[model samples]
Target: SYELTQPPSVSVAPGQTARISCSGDNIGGTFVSWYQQKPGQAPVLVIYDDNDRPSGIPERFSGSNSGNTATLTISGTQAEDEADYYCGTWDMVTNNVFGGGTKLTVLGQPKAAPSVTLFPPSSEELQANKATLVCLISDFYPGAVTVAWKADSSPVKAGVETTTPSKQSNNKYAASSYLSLTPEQWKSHRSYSCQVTHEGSTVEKTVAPT
Candidate 1:
Protein backbone atom coordinates (compact mmCIF):
# COMPACT_ATOMS: atom_id res chain seq x y z
CA SER A 1 0.00 0.00 0.00
CA TYR A 2 1.16 3.53 -0.73
CA GLU A 3 1.73 5.72 2.29
CA LEU A 4 1.32 9.44 2.97
CA THR A 5 2.29 11.28 6.08
CA GLN A 6 1.29 14.59 7.58
CA PRO A 7 2.37 16.24 10.78
CA PRO A 8 0.77 14.51 13.72
CA SER A 9 -0.75 17.72 15.02
CA VAL A 10 -0.60 21.49 14.64
CA SER A 11 -1.96 24.48 16.54
CA VAL A 12 -2.66 27.99 15.31
CA ALA A 13 -4.86 30.98 15.98
CA PRO A 14 -8.23 31.52 14.33
CA GLY A 15 -7.06 34.16 11.91
CA GLN A 16 -3.77 32.50 11.10
CA THR A 17 -2.88 30.11 8.34
CA ALA A 18 -2.31 26.39 8.86
CA ARG A 19 -0.05 24.77 6.30
CA ILE A 20 -0.23 20.97 6.32
CA SER A 21 2.12 18.87 4.26
CA CYS A 22 1.98 15.26 3.09
CA SER A 23 4.85 13.02 2.07
CA GLY A 24 4.55 9.80 0.16
CA ASP A 25 6.51 7.57 -2.22
CA ASN A 26 5.67 6.78 -5.86
CA ILE A 27 2.92 9.40 -5.75
CA GLY A 28 4.60 12.47 -7.15
CA GLY A 29 2.98 12.25 -10.56
CA THR A 30 -0.49 11.45 -9.27
CA PHE A 31 -3.20 13.95 -8.48
CA VAL A 32 -3.65 14.90 -4.85
CA SER A 33 -6.83 15.39 -2.85
CA TRP A 34 -7.46 16.78 0.61
CA TYR A 35 -10.25 16.16 3.07
CA GLN A 36 -11.45 17.63 6.33
CA GLN A 37 -13.12 15.43 8.91
CA LYS A 38 -14.91 16.69 11.96
CA PRO A 39 -15.39 14.52 14.99
CA GLY A 40 -18.05 11.82 14.55
CA GLN A 41 -18.46 12.53 10.85
CA ALA A 42 -17.19 11.34 7.53
CA PRO A 43 -14.44 13.23 5.78
CA VAL A 44 -15.53 16.02 3.46
CA LEU A 45 -13.66 16.89 0.31
CA VAL A 46 -12.07 20.29 0.56
CA ILE A 47 -9.69 20.32 -2.34
CA TYR A 48 -9.50 17.94 -5.24
CA ASP A 49 -6.97 17.31 -8.01
CA ASP A 50 -4.38 19.23 -5.97
CA ASN A 51 -5.94 22.69 -6.50
CA ASP A 52 -9.62 22.70 -7.34
CA ARG A 53 -11.93 23.81 -4.61
CA PRO A 54 -15.22 21.96 -4.52
CA SER A 55 -18.60 23.59 -4.96
CA GLY A 56 -20.10 25.26 -1.88
CA ILE A 57 -16.76 25.05 -0.12
CA PRO A 58 -14.95 28.10 1.15
CA GLU A 59 -11.82 29.42 -0.55
CA ARG A 60 -9.82 29.53 2.66
CA PHE A 61 -8.61 25.99 2.00
CA SER A 62 -6.44 25.14 -0.99
CA GLY A 63 -4.23 22.29 -2.08
CA SER A 64 -0.86 22.31 -3.81
CA ASN A 65 2.11 20.11 -4.41
CA SER A 66 5.84 20.67 -4.44
CA GLY A 67 8.56 18.10 -5.03
CA ASN A 68 7.45 14.88 -3.33
CA THR A 69 5.23 16.55 -0.77
CA ALA A 70 1.67 17.73 -1.19
CA THR A 71 0.38 20.62 0.87
CA LEU A 72 -2.99 21.84 2.10
CA THR A 73 -3.11 25.46 3.11
CA ILE A 74 -5.94 26.80 5.25
CA SER A 75 -5.94 30.58 5.65
CA GLY A 76 -7.92 32.71 8.04
CA THR A 77 -9.05 29.61 9.85
CA GLN A 78 -12.07 29.88 12.12
CA ALA A 79 -13.32 27.67 14.91
CA GLU A 80 -15.13 25.42 12.46
CA ASP A 81 -11.90 24.70 10.64
CA GLU A 82 -10.40 22.97 13.61
CA ALA A 83 -10.58 19.28 12.74
CA ASP A 84 -8.65 16.36 11.33
CA TYR A 85 -7.18 16.76 7.84
CA TYR A 86 -6.02 14.07 5.47
CA CYS A 87 -4.47 13.88 2.03
CA GLY A 88 -5.31 11.31 -0.59
CA THR A 89 -3.87 10.10 -3.85
CA TRP A 90 -4.43 7.41 -6.43
CA ASP A 91 -1.43 5.77 -8.07
CA MET A 92 -1.09 2.86 -10.43
CA VAL A 93 0.18 0.32 -7.92
CA THR A 94 -1.91 1.03 -4.80
CA ASN A 95 -4.83 2.65 -6.67
CA ASN A 96 -5.85 4.66 -3.60
CA VAL A 97 -4.01 5.93 -0.51
CA PHE A 98 -4.42 8.45 2.23
CA GLY A 99 -2.10 10.29 4.58
CA GLY A 100 -1.58 9.51 8.20
CA GLY A 101 -3.81 12.48 9.00
CA THR A 102 -3.16 15.70 10.92
CA LYS A 103 -5.19 17.13 13.73
CA LEU A 104 -5.62 20.88 13.29
CA THR A 105 -6.25 22.47 16.65
CA VAL A 106 -7.35 26.08 16.26
CA LEU A 107 -5.66 27.57 19.26
CA GLY A 108 -7.51 30.58 20.52
CA GLN A 109 -7.70 31.55 24.16
CA PRO A 110 -6.29 29.11 26.66
CA LYS A 111 -8.52 26.11 27.12
CA ALA A 112 -11.22 26.59 29.72
CA ALA A 113 -12.16 23.81 32.04
CA PRO A 114 -15.73 22.73 31.66
CA SER A 115 -18.11 24.42 34.02
CA VAL A 116 -19.82 21.64 35.87
CA THR A 117 -23.09 21.87 37.75
CA LEU A 118 -24.86 19.17 39.70
CA PHE A 119 -28.64 18.88 39.59
CA PRO A 120 -30.74 16.59 41.70
CA PRO A 121 -33.75 14.83 40.37
CA SER A 122 -37.31 15.83 41.07
CA SER A 123 -38.97 15.28 44.47
CA GLU A 124 -41.07 12.51 43.02
CA GLU A 125 -37.94 10.66 41.98
CA LEU A 126 -36.49 10.98 45.45
CA GLN A 127 -39.69 9.73 47.00
CA ALA A 128 -39.88 6.94 44.48
CA ASN A 129 -36.64 5.56 45.86
CA LYS A 130 -34.72 6.53 42.71
CA ALA A 131 -32.69 9.60 41.83
CA THR A 132 -30.67 10.95 38.97
CA LEU A 133 -27.75 13.34 39.32
CA VAL A 134 -27.02 15.35 36.22
CA CYS A 135 -23.74 16.99 35.44
CA LEU A 136 -24.00 19.92 33.09
CA ILE A 137 -20.64 20.64 31.46
CA SER A 138 -20.43 23.79 29.43
CA ASP A 139 -18.17 26.57 28.10
CA PHE A 140 -15.20 24.31 27.50
CA TYR A 141 -12.46 24.78 24.97
CA PRO A 142 -10.84 22.40 22.46
CA GLY A 143 -14.31 20.82 22.17
CA ALA A 144 -13.14 17.68 23.93
CA VAL A 145 -13.97 16.76 27.53
CA THR A 146 -14.72 13.90 29.86
CA VAL A 147 -17.33 13.81 32.61
CA ALA A 148 -17.93 11.21 35.26
CA TRP A 149 -19.51 10.79 38.66
CA LYS A 150 -18.16 9.62 41.95
CA ALA A 151 -19.90 8.56 45.13
CA ASP A 152 -18.03 9.15 48.37
CA SER A 153 -14.65 9.12 46.57
CA SER A 154 -15.53 5.95 44.74
CA PRO A 155 -15.81 5.91 40.95
CA VAL A 156 -19.32 5.29 39.64
CA LYS A 157 -19.89 3.18 36.55
CA ALA A 158 -23.36 1.69 36.59
CA GLY A 159 -26.45 3.65 35.56
CA VAL A 160 -24.30 6.35 33.97
CA GLU A 161 -25.04 7.92 30.61
CA THR A 162 -22.67 10.43 29.10
CA THR A 163 -23.29 12.28 25.88
CA THR A 164 -20.45 13.27 23.62
CA PRO A 165 -19.30 16.83 23.90
CA SER A 166 -21.25 18.97 21.46
CA LYS A 167 -20.13 22.21 19.84
CA GLN A 168 -22.05 25.25 20.99
CA SER A 169 -22.85 28.47 19.11
CA ASN A 170 -20.02 30.31 20.89
CA ASN A 171 -17.45 28.01 19.32
CA LYS A 172 -17.01 26.19 22.60
CA TYR A 173 -18.50 22.87 23.71
CA ALA A 174 -21.05 21.44 26.10
CA ALA A 175 -21.94 18.01 27.40
CA SER A 176 -24.03 16.25 30.02
CA SER A 177 -23.98 13.11 32.08
CA TYR A 178 -26.59 11.43 34.23
CA LEU A 179 -25.90 9.16 37.15
CA SER A 180 -28.68 7.04 38.52
CA LEU A 181 -28.94 5.79 42.05
CA THR A 182 -31.47 4.74 44.57
CA PRO A 183 -32.76 7.34 47.00
CA GLU A 184 -31.32 5.25 49.79
CA GLN A 185 -27.91 5.42 48.12
CA TRP A 186 -28.33 9.14 47.48
CA LYS A 187 -29.22 9.85 51.09
CA SER A 188 -26.54 7.54 52.36
CA HIS A 189 -23.63 9.08 50.48
CA ARG A 190 -22.17 12.12 52.18
CA SER A 191 -20.43 13.27 49.00
CA TYR A 192 -21.39 13.11 45.35
CA SER A 193 -18.96 14.68 42.96
CA CYS A 194 -19.20 15.56 39.28
CA GLN A 195 -15.75 15.45 37.77
CA VAL A 196 -15.02 17.20 34.50
CA THR A 197 -11.70 16.70 32.74
CA HIS A 198 -10.68 18.96 29.87
CA GLU A 199 -7.36 20.08 28.45
CA GLY A 200 -5.35 18.23 31.06
CA SER A 201 -7.12 19.78 34.02
CA THR A 202 -9.79 18.29 36.24
CA VAL A 203 -12.54 20.34 37.85
CA GLU A 204 -14.91 18.68 40.24
CA LYS A 205 -18.19 19.91 41.66
CA THR A 206 -19.62 18.09 44.60
CA VAL A 207 -23.04 18.12 46.20
CA ALA A 208 -25.12 16.04 48.58
CA PRO A 209 -28.75 15.11 48.91
CA THR A 210 -31.20 17.92 49.26
Candidate 2:
Protein backbone atom coordinates (compact mmCIF):
# COMPACT_ATOMS: atom_id res chain seq x y z
CA SER A 1 0.00 0.00 0.00
CA TYR A 2 1.08 3.64 -0.69
CA GLU A 3 0.26 6.70 1.36
CA LEU A 4 0.15 10.44 0.52
CA THR A 5 -0.79 13.48 2.54
CA GLN A 6 -1.92 17.08 1.75
CA PRO A 7 -2.28 19.77 4.36
CA PRO A 8 -5.42 21.77 5.12
CA SER A 9 -7.40 21.02 1.96
CA VAL A 10 -9.43 23.99 0.69
CA SER A 11 -12.63 24.99 -1.08
CA VAL A 12 -12.81 28.01 -3.41
CA ALA A 13 -15.40 29.88 -5.41
CA PRO A 14 -15.89 29.29 -9.12
CA GLY A 15 -13.66 31.47 -11.36
CA GLN A 16 -11.36 31.72 -8.36
CA THR A 17 -8.17 29.66 -8.45
CA ALA A 18 -6.68 27.32 -5.82
CA ARG A 19 -3.53 25.23 -5.61
CA ILE A 20 -2.87 21.89 -3.95
CA SER A 21 0.75 20.92 -3.40
CA CYS A 22 1.74 17.26 -3.27
CA SER A 23 4.68 16.52 -1.08
CA GLY A 24 6.54 13.31 -0.37
CA ASP A 25 9.77 12.71 1.42
CA ASN A 26 10.95 9.96 -0.94
CA ILE A 27 9.53 11.05 -4.30
CA GLY A 28 13.11 12.09 -5.17
CA GLY A 29 13.77 13.88 -8.49
CA THR A 30 11.31 11.82 -10.53
CA PHE A 31 8.87 13.22 -13.08
CA VAL A 32 5.67 14.49 -11.47
CA SER A 33 2.22 14.82 -13.07
CA TRP A 34 -1.33 16.10 -12.38
CA TYR A 35 -4.77 15.01 -13.51
CA GLN A 36 -8.35 16.30 -13.47
CA GLN A 37 -11.54 14.24 -13.56
CA LYS A 38 -15.16 15.35 -13.61
CA PRO A 39 -18.45 13.58 -13.27
CA GLY A 40 -19.31 11.28 -16.20
CA GLN A 41 -15.98 12.08 -17.90
CA ALA A 42 -12.60 10.46 -18.18
CA PRO A 43 -9.63 11.78 -16.24
CA VAL A 44 -7.52 14.25 -18.23
CA LEU A 45 -3.93 15.26 -17.65
CA VAL A 46 -3.56 18.92 -16.79
CA ILE A 47 0.14 19.02 -16.01
CA TYR A 48 3.06 16.70 -16.45
CA ASP A 49 6.76 16.45 -15.43
CA ASP A 50 6.50 19.54 -13.25
CA ASN A 51 5.90 22.09 -16.07
CA ASP A 52 5.59 20.64 -19.54
CA ARG A 53 2.45 20.71 -21.63
CA PRO A 54 1.10 17.40 -22.80
CA SER A 55 0.23 17.28 -26.51
CA GLY A 56 -3.27 18.64 -27.32
CA ILE A 57 -3.59 20.20 -23.86
CA PRO A 58 -5.65 23.31 -23.21
CA GLU A 59 -4.35 26.74 -22.12
CA ARG A 60 -6.10 26.66 -18.77
CA PHE A 61 -3.86 23.87 -17.50
CA SER A 62 -0.50 24.81 -15.97
CA GLY A 63 2.15 23.64 -13.51
CA SER A 64 5.26 24.74 -11.60
CA ASN A 65 7.98 23.12 -9.55
CA SER A 66 10.29 24.32 -6.79
CA GLY A 67 12.83 22.10 -5.12
CA ASN A 68 10.96 18.93 -4.13
CA THR A 69 7.45 20.37 -4.26
CA ALA A 70 5.42 20.36 -7.49
CA THR A 71 2.38 22.57 -7.75
CA LEU A 72 -0.64 22.12 -10.05
CA THR A 73 -2.68 25.25 -10.67
CA ILE A 74 -6.01 25.44 -12.45
CA SER A 75 -6.72 28.94 -13.70
CA GLY A 76 -10.26 30.30 -13.98
CA THR A 77 -11.47 27.34 -11.97
CA GLN A 78 -14.38 25.90 -13.91
CA ALA A 79 -16.83 23.34 -12.60
CA GLU A 80 -14.70 20.83 -14.42
CA ASP A 81 -11.85 21.01 -11.90
CA GLU A 82 -14.02 19.69 -9.11
CA ALA A 83 -12.41 16.26 -9.13
CA ASP A 84 -9.59 14.22 -7.71
CA TYR A 85 -5.90 15.10 -8.31
CA TYR A 86 -2.84 12.97 -7.89
CA CYS A 87 0.96 13.11 -8.28
CA GLY A 88 3.53 10.48 -9.03
CA THR A 89 7.24 9.99 -9.59
CA TRP A 90 9.39 7.38 -11.29
CA ASP A 91 12.23 5.79 -9.35
CA MET A 92 14.25 2.87 -10.62
CA VAL A 93 15.25 1.94 -7.07
CA THR A 94 11.76 1.83 -5.58
CA ASN A 95 10.06 0.67 -8.73
CA ASN A 96 7.12 3.13 -8.70
CA VAL A 97 5.15 4.95 -6.04
CA PHE A 98 2.06 7.14 -6.70
CA GLY A 99 0.52 9.61 -4.33
CA GLY A 100 -2.98 9.06 -3.00
CA GLY A 101 -5.52 11.18 -4.89
CA THR A 102 -6.73 14.48 -3.44
CA LYS A 103 -10.22 15.71 -4.18
CA LEU A 104 -10.79 19.39 -5.13
CA THR A 105 -14.14 21.02 -4.68
CA VAL A 106 -15.60 24.33 -5.95
CA LEU A 107 -17.97 26.12 -3.62
CA GLY A 108 -21.29 27.62 -4.66
CA GLN A 109 -21.09 31.15 -6.07
CA PRO A 110 -22.18 34.01 -3.87
CA LYS A 111 -24.82 36.38 -5.21
CA ALA A 112 -24.94 34.26 -8.35
CA ALA A 113 -27.59 35.10 -10.91
CA PRO A 114 -30.22 32.37 -11.02
CA SER A 115 -29.63 29.74 -13.77
CA VAL A 116 -31.93 27.02 -15.29
CA THR A 117 -32.02 23.83 -17.42
CA LEU A 118 -34.50 21.20 -18.72
CA PHE A 119 -34.20 17.42 -18.37
CA PRO A 120 -35.40 14.75 -20.88
CA PRO A 121 -32.62 15.76 -23.23
CA SER A 122 -33.12 18.74 -25.52
CA SER A 123 -34.52 16.45 -28.23
CA GLU A 124 -37.24 14.35 -26.68
CA GLU A 125 -40.89 14.61 -27.67
CA LEU A 126 -43.36 15.78 -25.06
CA GLN A 127 -46.97 14.88 -24.20
CA ALA A 128 -49.67 17.36 -23.25
CA ASN A 129 -49.09 18.71 -19.69
CA LYS A 130 -46.37 16.15 -19.20
CA ALA A 131 -42.92 17.64 -19.11
CA THR A 132 -40.34 18.58 -16.50
CA LEU A 133 -37.58 21.15 -16.64
CA VAL A 134 -34.40 20.98 -14.58
CA CYS A 135 -32.09 23.95 -14.53
CA LEU A 136 -28.62 24.15 -13.02
CA ILE A 137 -25.77 26.62 -12.67
CA SER A 138 -22.48 24.89 -13.07
CA ASP A 139 -19.37 26.02 -11.15
CA PHE A 140 -21.30 28.30 -8.84
CA TYR A 141 -19.44 29.05 -5.61
CA PRO A 142 -20.03 30.64 -2.23
CA GLY A 143 -23.71 31.68 -2.34
CA ALA A 144 -27.38 30.99 -2.87
CA VAL A 145 -29.01 30.31 -6.27
CA THR A 146 -32.43 30.90 -7.84
CA VAL A 147 -33.86 29.85 -11.22
CA ALA A 148 -36.66 31.12 -13.44
CA TRP A 149 -38.30 30.55 -16.82
CA LYS A 150 -38.69 33.18 -19.53
CA ALA A 151 -41.30 32.85 -22.26
CA ASP A 152 -38.84 33.49 -25.08
CA SER A 153 -35.62 34.64 -23.42
CA SER A 154 -37.73 37.67 -22.51
CA PRO A 155 -37.91 38.47 -18.80
CA VAL A 156 -41.17 37.56 -17.14
CA LYS A 157 -42.40 38.20 -13.63
CA ALA A 158 -42.47 34.81 -11.96
CA GLY A 159 -41.34 33.11 -8.78
CA VAL A 160 -39.06 30.11 -8.44
CA GLU A 161 -41.18 27.09 -7.77
CA THR A 162 -38.55 24.89 -6.11
CA THR A 163 -34.84 24.83 -5.32
CA THR A 164 -32.39 22.39 -3.68
CA PRO A 165 -28.72 22.27 -2.76
CA SER A 166 -27.00 18.91 -2.58
CA LYS A 167 -23.53 17.48 -2.52
CA GLN A 168 -22.44 15.20 -5.30
CA SER A 169 -21.59 11.62 -4.34
CA ASN A 170 -18.01 12.83 -4.45
CA ASN A 171 -19.00 15.46 -1.87
CA LYS A 172 -19.03 18.51 -4.14
CA TYR A 173 -21.76 21.12 -3.66
CA ALA A 174 -24.37 21.89 -6.30
CA ALA A 175 -27.71 23.66 -6.71
CA SER A 176 -30.70 22.49 -8.74
CA SER A 177 -34.18 23.63 -9.76
CA TYR A 178 -37.23 21.75 -11.04
CA LEU A 179 -40.17 23.09 -12.99
CA SER A 180 -43.32 21.54 -14.41
CA LEU A 181 -44.54 22.70 -17.79
CA THR A 182 -47.12 21.70 -20.36
CA PRO A 183 -46.13 19.58 -23.35
CA GLU A 184 -47.38 22.41 -25.55
CA GLN A 185 -44.57 24.60 -24.27
CA TRP A 186 -42.11 21.80 -25.01
CA LYS A 187 -43.48 21.39 -28.56
CA SER A 188 -43.64 25.13 -29.20
CA HIS A 189 -39.89 25.35 -28.71
CA ARG A 190 -40.23 27.47 -25.61
CA SER A 191 -36.88 28.30 -24.07
CA TYR A 192 -36.10 27.52 -20.45
CA SER A 193 -33.02 28.94 -18.78
CA CYS A 194 -31.17 28.69 -15.48
CA GLN A 195 -29.60 31.95 -14.36
CA VAL A 196 -27.01 31.77 -11.56
CA THR A 197 -25.42 34.77 -9.90
CA HIS A 198 -22.78 33.81 -7.38
CA GLU A 199 -20.08 35.82 -5.63
CA GLY A 200 -19.26 38.20 -8.49
CA SER A 201 -19.89 36.13 -11.62
CA THR A 202 -23.16 35.09 -13.21
CA VAL A 203 -23.63 32.05 -15.51
CA GLU A 204 -26.63 30.55 -17.29
CA LYS A 205 -27.71 27.59 -19.44
CA THR A 206 -30.72 27.49 -21.77
CA VAL A 207 -32.61 24.71 -23.55
CA ALA A 208 -35.66 24.65 -25.79
CA PRO A 209 -38.33 22.02 -25.21
CA THR A 210 -37.94 19.12 -27.59
Highest lDDT scorer: 1
Measured with C-alpha atoms, the lDDT of residue 198 in candidate 2 is: 58
lDDT of 1 by residue, 37-148 (tens): 9988999999999899989999888888866888899899898998899999998787888998998988765677788888877798887778988889999887777777
Local distance difference test values of all predictions, in order:
0.86, 0.62
lDDT: worst 10-residue window of model 1: 106-115
Q: How many backbone clashes does candidate 2 have?
A: 30
C-alpha lDDT of residue 155 in model 1: 91
lDDT of 2 by residue, 60-162 (tens): 7788766557777877887766777776666666555666677776764343333344464333435234666676654433334555556577764443465
Model 1 C-alpha RMSD to native: 4.8
Candidate 1 local Cα displacement, residue 23, angstroms:
9.0
Which residues of candidate 2, in runs, are more than 4 Å off? 1-4, 26-28, 39-42, 109-210
